[PDB]
């Protein structure tokens, strides 16, 4: 039910494979290059877990706003997400974690919506700006 040493060793190998140096931190955009290369018991199925993988990527992008993220942060994150938090956490920490995950989920949902918003805003701004040019001509 818990993250073992075999899982930790495999994660360490993957970390040393995605982190070219021995600096111990990676730019957050590289974080996905960790999660999807991770194999075995920690593997995530891209054909079934898309929502969960995206959630993890956004979580490790929020932890520090565009910040570079440490080995310990991603390891804690995998630990939290690999356990049935309702059983293995205290009440206040369970509430904190569940509210965090709720926030992450709605935040990423509207972060998807924002792209459609941007595109439609572009189209309508173009149309209205051309209409304002017409009105300027009417001046």
């Amino acid at each position: 039910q818990l993250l073992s040493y075999n899982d930790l060793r495999h994660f360490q190998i993957i970390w040393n494979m995605v982190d070219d140096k021995r600096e111990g931190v990676i730019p957050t955009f590289r974080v996905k290059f960790l999660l999807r290369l991770l194999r075995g018991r920690l593997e995530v199925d891209l054909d079934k877990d898309k929502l969960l993988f995206k959630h993890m990527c956004y979580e490790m992008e929020r932890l520090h706003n565009g910040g570079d993220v440490t080995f310990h942060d991603v390891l804690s994150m995998l630990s939290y997400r690999s356990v049935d938090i309702r059983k293995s956490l205290q009440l206040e920490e369970l509430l904190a974690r569940e509210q965090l995950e709720y926030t992450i989920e709605e935040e990423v949902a509207k972060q998807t919506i924002r792209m459609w918003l941007k595109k439609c805003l572009k189209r309508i701004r173009a149309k209205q700006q051309q209409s304002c040019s017409i009105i300027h001509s009417l001046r």
């Binding site: 304002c132 009105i135 300027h136 001046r139």
Partner: protein
């Protein structure tokens, strides 16, 4: 007899569909009940108070036990709950109560003040009160939805509040569910008018607030923390709680007399009134001092004419991506002063 017939219609509303052709919902059409309100999420108050020891729920040092049970059983208002509906077993039913029967509620409310006594000793007001009480305890939603939705489409808030006040005073109470739903609906209406522009929006808000404090006295589990969090999540706490802090707009955009003319994007500080903003507008727009008492800043969207000495940050607490749009409109000073007086 009219009151009694209304009661019967109410008590028979769930037994209409079965009586006619099978699957007649598709062949016979009744328009759905229009509901534009999004009640606060989570729901503000407790929907109901449980009976302490219900003789119809099967589940369940002695003398203390009986004493406690007795005391708790005395405290619970058995007459405030729909006894037979609670006591029925739980194993859909559709209700056909068109909007033109709900209008009959108001005449019944009036009749609750009719003292005339029939030759058998029955008084109109007593039967009216009994019927209305039974309806309100059974289903407040069906009996108040008509009014709540009607208010949106017309400027008759005053009438609604008068009717609700008469109802409260004649019945003398609101059982916990009636007040719960009423309060939630009123708050939903307030937020709706806050968001959607309307000609009589702020008037409706004022009318609602003039009466909300009478309902609030009958909500059982309404706590400050929950209210604060819900309102903040809804982004309308300012209109409800005086203890609301909201950083106002940093900047404002004002349009001139002409259409699509170069507007002005002025700054807004924490201690700036509309007077300085209007002075800057006059300076920018090259308006002579002789004609300087005919121009006022007003919000066309919300139909607000701004008073000189009211702080800008108070009227536009929202610090969004979009700055409020104002207009420098010219009019006779007397009419502007009258409108300012009305709005203040």
């Amino acid at each position: 007899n009219a009151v009694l017939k209304f009661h019967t219609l109410w008590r028979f509303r769930y037994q209409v569909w079965p009586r006619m052709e099978e699957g007649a919902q598709q062949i016979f059409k009744i328009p759905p009940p229009s509901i534009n309100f999004t009640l606060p999420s989570p729901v503000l108050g407790m929907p109901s108070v449980p009976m302490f020891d219900p003789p119809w729920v099967p589940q369940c040092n002695l003398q203390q036990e009986e004493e406690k049970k007795r005391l708790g059983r005395e405290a619970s208002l058995i007459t405030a709950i729909p006894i037979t509906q609670e006591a029925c077993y739980e194993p859909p039913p559709q209700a056909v109560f068109p909007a033109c029967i709900c209008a009959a509620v108001l005449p019944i409310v009036h009749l609750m003040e009719d003292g005339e006594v029939r030759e058998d000793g029955v008084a109109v007001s007593a039967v009216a009160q009994q019927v209305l009480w039974n309806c309100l305890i059974e289903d407040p939603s069906t009996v108040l939805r008509h009014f709540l939705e009607k208010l949106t489409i017309s400027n008759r808030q005053d009438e609604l509040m008068y009717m609700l006040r008469k109802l409260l005073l004649n019945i003398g109470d609101f059982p916990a569910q009636t007040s719960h739903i009423l309060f939630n609906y009123l708050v939903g209406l307030i937020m709706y008018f806050v968001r959607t522009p309307c000609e009589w929006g702020m008037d409706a808000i004022s009318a609602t607030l003039t009466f909300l404090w009478e309902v609030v006295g009958y909500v059982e589990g309404l706590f400050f923390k929950d209210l604060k969090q819900t309102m903040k999540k809804e982004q309308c706490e300012v209109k409800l709680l005086v203890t609301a802090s909201m950083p106002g707009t940093k900047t404002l955009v004002v349009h001139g007399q002409n259409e699509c003319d170069i507007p002005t994007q002025l700054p807004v500080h924490e201690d700036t009134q509309f007077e300085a903003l209007l002075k800057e507008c006059l300076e920018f727009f090259n308006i002579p001092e002789s004609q300087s008492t005919h121009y006022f800043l007003m919000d066309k969207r919300w139909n607000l004419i701004h008073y000189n000495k009211t702080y800008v940050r108070d009227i536009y607490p929202f610090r969004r991506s979009v700055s409020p749009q104002l207009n420098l409109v010219h009019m006779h000073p007397e009419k502007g002063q009258e409108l300012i007086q009305k709005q203040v």
